[PDB]
Ligand binder design. Structure first.
Ligand code: HEM
Length: 82
């Protein structure tokens, strides 16, 4: 089933040991992706622990990038925090 994470819990994952971010209500664990991301590690680290949906869409990722992003989904933002 779907696992929910509250905004409070997501905010704790804003470091090198654990980098999580929110995109369109979905939670992504990008910890192991930081060094492979074509756009660099900095833009990810800076948005860690929060909603980066706007910044993500503002750069205009390709279909391949979006398809790949799905493999990093670990749950969704708790409904009451949306
Ligand atoms: C959800 C995980 C994400 C994946 C899997 C991902 C994947 C990629 C890939 C494959 C590219 C290469 C171009 C393309 O195929 O569109 C790219 C470029 C880029 N990404 Fe991401 N990205 C993710 C999240 C983000 C986020 C959250 C930001 C910003 C807050 C970001 C900023 C960038 C930037 C700036 C580039 C541009 C590189 C350039 O033009 O030199 N990405 N990303």
């Amino acid at each position: 089933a779907v696992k929910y994470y509250t905004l409070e819990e997501i905010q704790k994952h804003n470091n090198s040991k654990s980098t999580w971010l929110i995109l369109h209500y979905k939670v992504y664990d990008l910890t192991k992706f930081l060094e492979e991301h074509p756009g660099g590690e900095a833009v990810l680290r800076a948005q860690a622990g929060g909603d980066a949906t706007a910044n993500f869409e503002a750069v205009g990722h390709s279909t391949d990038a979006r398809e790949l992003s799905k493999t990093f989904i670990i749950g969704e933002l708790h409904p009451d925090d949306r």
